[model samples]
Target: MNLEKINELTAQDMAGVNAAILEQLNSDVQLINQLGYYIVSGGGKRIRPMIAVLAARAVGYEGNAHVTIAALIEFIHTATLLHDDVVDESDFGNAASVLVGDFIYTRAFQMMTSLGSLKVLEVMSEAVNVIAEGEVLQLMNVNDPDITEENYMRVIYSKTARLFEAAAQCSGILAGCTPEEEKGLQDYGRYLGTAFQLIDDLLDYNKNVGDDLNEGKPTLPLLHAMHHGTPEQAQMIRTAIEQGNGRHLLEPVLEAMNACGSLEWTRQRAEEEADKAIAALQVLPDTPWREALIGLAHIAVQR
Candidate 1:
């Protein structure tokens, strides 16, 4: 299954985007570099870069900047995963984790030389800065369950939304859209990205992601339940979070989500944010690419 609405789109949904990414990554890398490359290509839907391409198309940019923007976005994403796994102290066999995350971060940045455009470089640097800072922020705050919704919002923005923002920025730069139009597209990407993270947090408590619990990210649904559930329910989750016994208790936590209505909340939040994404598109001319992107926004929120 795709992480986003990729299933609804065909290979021709955004032709040449994939080939462009392929051309950029086709290389004999240093053995260490391959780790970042392998994990990045492992099974992701490439939804972020796809958004970049779609944004370019929607804004009527017929030129080929989308190709380079897509590849740059992927590299930035790869660097985050490397640093993320490292900071999380995860058992990532990927090469990015070989040295507490610095190795992959440096290497990924090094890949920037191949792009060679000042605009491209500036956007990428901004993306990496936001994402990396987000990771440190997450590390600083993960275990403090008392964090406000605003802080959670910041986490969402920093760790996820701004990457999308940067991707959309690249799209605007390539298209040379009006200043206001460009910001609106960037807003669309940022809002959708927030919803994406919310769902990821929700999925951690779903039966589908027992490993998430085992991995120690007591994610949104569980956290939501904790804040809203009765004392007994809260205790059940506290013990679970503290114990980290997700494999054995998967069904029960899912049951908790059901009982507390967190599943519905998760879905609703995604849908609402997806609506925001669509609404943000009002600044632009409507194209098939725009409509498809709108469809994907709503689809991302759905199961």
Candidate 2:
């Protein structure tokens, strides 16, 4: 149930999901088509759609609706990515990104209506609303040195984990899963999504190093270092958080994080979430799809 094996197991289903995505992304508007293709084809792991496909199959779903579900889940995710880039003032045009994000978001709703399931609609609609609220919450937290761990967790759950939770829960709903099974999938998605975001925050320290710091994000690693570093180190981090453009502080910040084991602490928290995600799958029947879900949680923490 490693990544290679998981990919093989979901290959066919994912193929269908890809086709659906491309189909739904088609537009007569030139800019919409261009930007839509550009962003959607960008290198994303498609983890949300993969979870949808896997969860459906794990629940013994036989219909093609799951393909639609998977694809639309990706659309929702991509739409958010577009909007988020605009919000973050990343390397994208503000007006174009925001408009295209709206386009893809409405397109996802169209796909949701095609599913003809009020239950699915209910779950996805609520998930998207919550995600928006989370985005605003995150915006409010930016450059705020007083952000607490609990508040950070709430933001991640609302912004990130909520979508994953809907993806899995909708798949189970489509598959006619029993109450307990649906809840199991929901919990699995929530925990796995949390772990994924946690690891992502941790990786920012190693891969991009100070991108989040430059953005003045109060991620777990930064929060941990701020709390645990020496008085001077803590003060430095506090100032860095309060005033971004602190890329110059990378060396000492890395030193503080290293001495405080902040990165390791974040990783350990991720591992705990991944373990919880794995444990949540026990309610499902033993199958390769189920095993792959478990494996995905493991791989999530490791990466």
Candidate 3:
């Protein structure tokens, strides 16, 4: 199945999740309402919530609580982006962004209380904490050319994969999955999230080409190019990483990436992760929901 098919399968549940998100976003503070709506309505891909819904259905869940889980998952993601945009110095007022992010973050915790599931609360709370830690780790890694692949993987797991893992694992928890089933879903989420971020890093080089380089972010593709390029090329990339304003060197950097097959290597890595994500689904029943999960893994690596 393709993304279109997956969307079709989950459209009804996604609608419920979206409604919950909008309703729960309500606040007495006008600024909070405005900023919260602005960021949440900005049309992200909603992959986390989608995975939550599908995971619940795949595990034969019949209740509506998964909708709440999906909505709050998106809320957590939205809150992070608000703060992240502020940290990255976007056009939004920094004060407004930070406050609104806190509002949304606390709102998610409130939603968690409504669920009344201590297990779900535990999983989500830990996930959010790890995500914050991952952001800090990423901050430390930025402009540091000495970063290793292991460090990059850790950051991605904490920042990106952890939430995805929580989304799926919590859905399994809510669905009353067996431990093996929960583990299978969790592994699926971890692997898929890794593939997702790897593709994102690849896109930074393939489409935008220098957004990461310009920002001096040590993403996998850039790291690969630096390690595999010729001695002269390696120094150039090293200087580019150490110095943030490398937009002017886009041509040579792209050339280095091309010569070293960095983009291809990154793509291959993503594909491997995607494959593992699919493999993790073996414990799940062969329902369309499971097929959609598999389809999502394929889609993750493709786009």
Listed per candidate, the RMSD to the true structure in angstroms reads: 4.0, 1.9, 2.0
Model 2, runs deviating above 4 Å: 34-43, 87-91
For candidate 1, write residues 1-303 as lDDT tens digits: 333344354344345655554554454645444553564456656778778887887888877767667656766676576556543344255553545256445644654555556775687688778877877777665445556667767878888988887787777777888887788888888988988888777766554667755544556676777777788777776666665644686677677778888778877887788888889988889776777667767766777
lDDT of 2 at 52: 97
Itemize residue pairs with steric clashes in candidate 3: none
Off by over 4 Å in 3: 34-44, 87-91
TM-score of model number 2:
0.95
Give all candidates' CA lDDT scores.
0.69, 0.90, 0.89
The candidate that achieves the highest lDDT relative to the unseen native structure:
2
What residue runs in model 1 are displaced by over 4 Å at the alpha carbon? 1-15, 19-23, 30-44, 87-123
Query: If scored against the real structure, what TM-score would every candidate get?
Result: 0.81, 0.95, 0.95
Worst 10 contiguous positions by lDDT, candidate 1: 1-10
Q: Candidates sorted by TM-score, descending order?
A: 2, 3, 1
* Clash count per candidate: 0, 0, 0
Q: For model 3, where is the 10-residue window of minimal lDDT?
A: 84-93
